[PDB]
């Protein structure tokens, strides 16, 4: 028994995969579903710091499963849960600014940025680990 599939990173009972290719946000959602996973939805501050650190070290602009597509300015996770007030701190300075209509959230440097949903970026999938 091993808790995660090969090349997946285990963290606090879940498995994480960072892509080595780039897609737009809607295709990133599909990419994760095809491996029985979900474009990463963040549930805790520890998990946030864990993901941002890898995004900073790798220096890769990376999609997360969050958008304000349904209502501009109200951010929602792809599993339907709302962005909580205790997560607003992770936006980068001056963000979210929706310049040129940016509806999808990404890891950018030390925090989050809203960027155009049609741009190709790396992504991270999340699924729960098996019990060994
Ligand atoms: C790399 O990050 C910058 O580019 C991202 C991609 O466009 C943005 O998503 C980020 O917000 C941020 N940004 C853009 C502007 C801006 C551009 C033109 C005129 N006025 C403001 N400000 N900050
Ligand atoms: Ca919009
Ligand atoms: Ca927006
Ligand atoms: Ca922005």
XYZ file of C-alpha atoms and ligand atoms in Angstrom:
158
model
C 0.000 0.000 0.000
C 1.098 3.542 -0.745
C -1.141 6.551 -0.042
C -0.711 8.493 -3.292
C -0.255 7.717 -6.992
C 3.246 7.939 -8.409
C 4.671 11.471 -8.705
C 1.943 12.825 -6.378
C 2.901 14.744 -3.235
C 1.359 13.649 0.065
C 0.320 16.316 2.568
C -1.956 15.948 5.602
C -4.018 13.093 4.227
C -4.264 14.322 0.626
C -2.310 13.906 -2.606
C -1.130 16.824 -4.739
C 0.102 16.953 -8.331
C 1.727 19.932 -10.032
C 1.622 19.793 -13.819
C 4.650 20.033 -16.086
C 2.521 21.535 -18.876
C 0.212 24.532 -19.239
C -3.509 24.845 -19.921
C -6.248 27.401 -19.426
C -8.331 27.227 -16.252
C -11.301 25.411 -17.795
C -9.006 22.791 -19.338
C -7.145 22.551 -16.014
C -10.400 21.571 -14.298
C -10.887 18.849 -16.910
C -7.281 17.672 -16.561
C -7.843 17.030 -12.851
C -11.219 15.320 -13.284
C -9.623 12.892 -15.747
C -7.365 11.561 -12.959
C -10.135 11.467 -10.363
C -9.070 14.737 -8.746
C -10.109 18.378 -8.411
C -8.363 21.620 -9.324
C -6.961 22.399 -5.918
C -9.483 23.737 -3.397
C -7.785 25.085 -0.267
C -9.357 24.336 3.115
C -6.747 25.540 5.625
C -3.974 28.064 6.181
C -1.389 25.285 6.530
C -2.442 23.930 3.131
C -2.184 27.420 1.617
C 1.370 27.951 2.873
C 2.244 24.456 1.647
C 1.032 25.182 -1.891
C 2.357 28.749 -2.160
C 5.834 27.618 -1.110
C 6.053 25.124 -3.979
C 4.684 27.741 -6.378
C 7.259 30.298 -5.207
C 10.208 27.887 -5.300
C 9.297 26.520 -8.732
C 8.597 30.075 -9.965
C 5.523 28.873 -11.861
C 2.282 30.812 -12.246
C -0.222 28.137 -11.271
C -4.000 27.855 -11.447
C -6.130 27.083 -8.401
C -9.773 26.069 -8.297
C -11.213 29.499 -7.510
C -13.091 32.013 -9.635
C -15.505 34.938 -9.595
C -17.029 33.894 -12.936
C -20.617 33.606 -11.674
C -20.574 36.973 -9.874
C -17.749 39.472 -10.376
C -16.019 40.113 -7.069
C -17.487 37.140 -5.174
C -14.913 34.342 -5.321
C -16.085 30.737 -5.186
C -14.249 27.425 -5.053
C -14.928 24.843 -7.743
C -16.524 22.567 -5.127
C -19.065 25.344 -4.499
C -17.718 26.536 -1.147
C -17.223 30.301 -0.779
C -13.926 32.062 -0.204
C -13.851 32.843 3.510
C -12.832 36.201 5.021
C -9.773 34.528 6.586
C -8.303 33.955 3.107
C -8.391 37.551 1.812
C -4.891 38.069 3.225
C -3.306 35.854 0.552
C -4.095 38.168 -2.369
C -1.043 40.019 -3.654
C -0.781 43.758 -3.087
C -3.283 45.559 -5.294
C -5.172 42.330 -6.078
C -7.755 41.261 -7.173
C -7.892 44.079 -9.738
C -9.787 42.436 -12.642
C -7.716 44.398 -15.175
C -8.889 43.409 -18.643
C -11.488 41.068 -17.095
C -9.590 38.525 -14.970
C -11.894 35.914 -13.424
C -9.615 33.021 -12.369
C -7.184 32.810 -9.447
C -3.540 31.723 -9.600
C -0.513 31.296 -7.374
C 1.754 34.243 -8.251
C 4.964 34.745 -6.304
C 4.139 34.987 -2.605
C 0.352 35.237 -2.934
C -2.670 35.102 -5.210
C -3.515 36.973 -8.405
C -6.616 37.111 -10.585
C -5.694 36.550 -14.235
C -7.439 35.932 -17.540
C -9.132 32.532 -17.599
C -8.030 31.837 -21.195
C -4.294 32.040 -20.423
C -2.281 28.832 -20.260
C -0.689 28.199 -16.867
C 0.464 25.283 -14.757
C -2.085 23.773 -12.383
C -2.337 21.633 -9.252
C -4.781 18.770 -8.717
C -5.865 17.444 -5.317
C -7.365 14.137 -4.222
C -7.507 12.264 -0.944
C -4.922 9.648 -0.023
C -5.498 5.930 0.384
C -5.297 4.450 3.879
C -2.304 2.210 4.573
C 2.100 40.198 -13.304
O 1.089 40.772 -12.607
C 0.527 41.849 -13.292
O -0.033 41.410 -14.517
C -1.044 40.401 -14.352
C -1.402 39.928 -15.742
O -1.995 40.970 -16.497
C -2.218 40.995 -13.579
O -3.221 40.004 -13.397
C -1.737 41.484 -12.221
O -2.783 42.187 -11.560
C -0.540 42.426 -12.370
N -0.941 43.787 -12.750
C -1.267 44.264 -13.966
C -1.548 45.590 -13.763
C -1.918 46.640 -14.731
C -1.654 46.488 -16.083
C -1.943 47.515 -16.962
C -2.493 48.675 -16.456
N -2.771 48.852 -15.159
C -2.487 47.841 -14.324
N -1.387 45.856 -12.436
N -1.014 44.759 -11.818
Ca -15.940 39.132 -14.609
Ca -13.024 39.149 -12.004
Ca -4.794 40.707 -11.275
